[PDB]
Design a protein around this ligand. Structure first.
Ligand SMILES: O=C(CN1Cc2ccc(Cl)cc2[C@H](C(=O)Nc2cncc3ccccc23)C1)Nc1cccc(N2CCOCC2)c1
Ligand SMILES: O=C(CN1Cc2ccc(Cl)cc2[C@H](C(=O)Nc2cncc3ccccc23)C1)Nc1cccc(N2CCOCC2)c1
Ligand SMILES: [Cl-]
Ligand code: NA
Lengths: 305, 305
């Protein structure tokens, strides 16, 4: 019993964290096999950041201008290339701690663990979600650039995010491990803003199924809804539209608890209307949207209470 | 910016997790130097759980009855002894991954990271607090026994908790690494219940300082209070009494934000009497009490390990 915002164990990623330095800038890198991946903005000065020409800045660099430190060991850079907004530094030593891994690009609503790092040294681990507006609500200070997001389903590490910047509202933007930004963001100090964010409807539904599995049914009702009537109500509370894909994804949890997806949708509609009336669901007074259907099945018991 | 429930990086503890099997029971063990530590109830059958005489059950056992697996490697048990509710299995191989460590007993209100494990394999990491009633609101399924709690101080792992049981309300009970229970619990199948819990006042105050640091100030007011008047109000809402030690501990955060501790206490008093009025603090509609003053300072300064 219980339900916590749970992160994957971070050890396999801690053994990959390194510090990358170019002139006066220092940030984090990810060392996998003989390559160190880091944000390309490590080659920038604070002045360069308004309209940097990364191709022009990089062409002026040699291998020996990049200092890479792994623990108290200096690694030797023997090659460098840019792939989208990521710099790939070839090094003369393969990481003996390289886990089994993949690079995966995730979609909004997906969750992952973040290993926040400073100067190549891990400081903390937390769980988060790719918001519908492609930002992440992280906890990052200056020097955290290059910290990564990942999942570890079945001993293989799937890297999905590399941290690049903090937007004016305090939220964060980054790229996949191939350097493609999530969202309409660019790695420069031009005026950019997070779009209006919405609630991840399929995740709130998954979390309501987690509450039922853990024994809580107070929020259920005798009603059902059509998918279109549900979406008309949900859009009025800034909730993402629920698609037939989301309904199919919730199938296993519907079968486990005996509550049809559109029946749980009717419960969500009522909760949006009435609020919680001094009650909580899984220790929360708000409707939680950073647990996916897959996270609920991974964490919860296979036997409903 | 940002504030998340953050755990310590778990790698140094992952390298210590092993599987302990005796009879039909399989649980987790902690391998440090040449000893594997695990709950002494691993020697019990379901029948033995009502009134176990653990010395009498342990006498029947020989070293070869305990099967210890470290990954896909069998460890050889060469001795066994009991210390309070913890079984210590001497093995013929020192853990080459043993970190610098200490066994520490924590007090209620203190937080720690839990590395939840099944079959000696780490599955997740989360942050939690030792409740004033000596339970932890964890997330544990059957097979999680032997999972440990810890903090990291510089490079030293301080182990503070080993998981033993789940109470009828879904909360959890365990021991320090010397086998002493936190709370009035016993390792046997008998009628046991968590006592009435209270809110950790000093931690709510620390979290209100974290909210101010992150830009949220709607709850601040021009008023102050005495420690005496604050405790009279706090006891009315089942909040733990605030002592001069807690006030001294909040000194750094008071100086950083310019809000005296008794000024923040006046804010907390108004929140208890009026509620939040549709507003949230750090994304929460409840007053969060699982961040200590040290956790707030650490997260708002990027300390690494
Ligand atoms: O001033 C900068 C400089 N950055 C420009 C810039 C532009 C484009 C790209 Cl791709 C990267 C970056 C870097 C950047 O965002 N770095 C950071 C990453 N994650 C968290 C951070 C938390 C604080 C600071 C930096 C962070 C560097 N940024 C900044 C963004 C948002 C708020 C603030 N603060 C309000 C004023 O007090 C001080 C913190 C300062
Ligand atoms: O079945 C057992 C047996 N335990 C006896 C026992 C006695 C003393 C000691 Cl020191 C340890 C233990 C074990 C124990 O607590 N293990 C567990 C630890 N963490 C999470 C768990 C999650 C599920 C199950 C076990 C868990 C094993 N307990 C149990 C725990 C919680 C609810 C219930 N309920 C039954 C009645 O229906 C409604 C659920 C039954
Ligand atoms: Cl995805
Ligand atoms: Na005040």
């Amino acid at each position: 019993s219980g339900f916590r915002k749970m992160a994957f164990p971070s050890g396999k990623v801690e053994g990959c964290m390194v510090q990358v330095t170019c002139g006066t800038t220092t940030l984090n890198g990810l060392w996998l096999d003989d390559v160190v991946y880091c944000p390309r903005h490590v080659i920038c000065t604070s002045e360069d950041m308004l309209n940097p020409n990364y191709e022009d800045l990089l062409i002026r660099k040699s291998n020996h201008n990049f200092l890479v430190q792994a623990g108290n060991v200096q690694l030797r850079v023997i090659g460098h290339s840019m792939q989208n907004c990521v710099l790939k530094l070839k090094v003369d030593t393969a990481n003996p701690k390289t886990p089994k891994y993949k690079f995966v690009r995730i979609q909004p609503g997906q969750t992952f663990s973040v290993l926040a790092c400073y100067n190549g040294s891990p400081s903390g681990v937390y769980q988060c979600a790719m918001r519908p507006n492609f930002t992440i609500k992280g906890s990052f200070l200056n020097g955290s650039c290059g910290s990564v997001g990942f999942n570890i389903d079945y001993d293989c590490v799937s890297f999905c995010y590399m941290h690049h910047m903090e937007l004016p509202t305090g939220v964060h933007a980054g790229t996949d491990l191939e350097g493609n930004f999530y969202g309409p963001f660019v790695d420069r100090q031009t005026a950019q803003a997070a779009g209006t964010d919405t609630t991840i409807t399929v995740n709130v539904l998954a979390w309501l199924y987690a509450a039922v599995i853990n024994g809580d049914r107070w929020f259920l009702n005798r009603f059902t809804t059509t998918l279109n009537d549900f979406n008309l109500v949900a859009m009025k509370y800034n909730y993402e539209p629920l698609t037939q894909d989301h309904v199919d994804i919730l199938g296993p949890l519907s079968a486990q608890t005996g509550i049809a997806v559109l029946d749980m949708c009717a419960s969500l509609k009522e909760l949006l209307q009435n609020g919680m009336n001094g009650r909580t669901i899984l220790g929360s007074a708000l409707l939680e949207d950073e647990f996916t259907p897959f996270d609920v099945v991974r964490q919860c018991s296979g036997v409903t209470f």
